[PDB]
Design a binder for this molecule. Structure first.
Ligand SMILES: COc1cc(NC(=O)c2ccc(C)c(Nc3nc(-c4cccnc4)nc4c3cnn4C)c2)cc(OC)c1
Length: 280
């Protein structure tokens, strides 16, 4: 990757925990960035993984994948530096802006997420935690796939007889074959994308809000699926459903998804919903 020198970085406003700062980065002028820093006390596990995340991020270069500016690996604090995404996480953003977007604008956000996942699928990179809480949004509504790593935070005692293996999965976002057999593929990512479509079209509602984790797992294997979002065009809900086919080989590929949405976008009568009608 690109090694940044501490001299070119300046932290400013703390904005989260993983800490994650807002700061500035000099190039020769300066730009705003997000700075992920390791806890002020760490282990070979918590440090070797911190660096290992950034080696993965550096492989990605796409308009819809969070862009790694560089890393600071030879000083304290160590830093993983990315572009700054002003509007934060998609799911919180959509609840904030509940109702303020047209169907065209929401489907444009899904097109961008799909385009990032298509790029990852062609790298043979499986995400495993594709959800709105892992999509960042910039001031131009461009959505970029990210991973905050909450699946890999473990609460095991350091002397426990039994420990978590293989991280944790987001039950409500994970395809059945992945839950049951740990068969993680881009096809299980497509399932998760279907859930993300539902998140966007409901402005961040909680999937299967009425049900417990075990009741979701039962519902899914009994053949039920999330219901239509309000004001959702027929074609969009039809597309989620195809993402949630029980046999993974029958689901669309991310390439088919990007293409299906492009066609709806360029024939926007297919995206008409009465709530977008203005009598004026
Ligand atoms: C192996 O796993 C992978 C790891 C990654 N890593 C990241 O996506 C990652 C790492 C480092 C940084 C600095 C950011 N940047 C942000 N993160 C947060 C944030 C806030 C609170 C808690 N956690 C995160 N807020 C941000 C930004 C930018 N703007 N804002 C408002 C993202 C990506 C992978 O696939 C592409 C795969």
């Amino acid at each position: 990757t690109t090694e940044i020198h501490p001299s070119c970085v300046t932290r400013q406003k703390v904005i989260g925990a993983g800490e994650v700062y807002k700061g500035m980065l000099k190039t020769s002028k300066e730009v705003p960035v997000a700075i992920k820093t390791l806890k002020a006390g760490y282990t070979e596990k918590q440090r070797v993984d911190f660096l290992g995340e950034a080696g993965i991020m550096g492989q990605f270069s796409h308009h819809n994948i969070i862009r790694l500016e560089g890393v600071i690996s030879k000083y304290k604090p160590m830093m993983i530096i990315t572009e700054y995404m002003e509007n934060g996480a998609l799911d919180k953003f959509l609840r904030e802006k509940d109702g303020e977007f047209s169907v065209l604008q929401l489907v444009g956000m899904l097109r961008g997420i799909a385009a990032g996942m298509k790029y990852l699928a062609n790298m043979n990179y499986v995400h495993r935690d594709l959800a709105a809480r892992n999509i960042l949004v910039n001031s131009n509504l461009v959505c970029k796939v990210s991973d905050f790593g909450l699946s890999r935070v473990l609460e095991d005692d350091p002397e426990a007889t039994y420990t978590t293996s293989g991280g944790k999965i987001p039950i409500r976002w994970t395809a059945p074959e992945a839950i049951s057999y740990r068969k993680f593929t881009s096809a299980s990512d497509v399932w998760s994308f279907g859930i993300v479509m539902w998140e966007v079209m409901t402005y961040g509602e909680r999937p299967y809000w009425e049900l417990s984790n075990h009741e979701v797992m039962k519902a899914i294997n009994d053949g039920f699926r999330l219901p239509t979002p309000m004001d959702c065009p027929s074609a969009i809900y039809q597309l989620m459903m195809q993402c949630w086919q029980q046999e993974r080989a029958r689901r669309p590929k991310f390439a088919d998804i990007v293409s299906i949405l492009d066609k709806l976008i360029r024939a926007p009568d297919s995206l008409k919903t009465l709530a977008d009608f203005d009598p004026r």
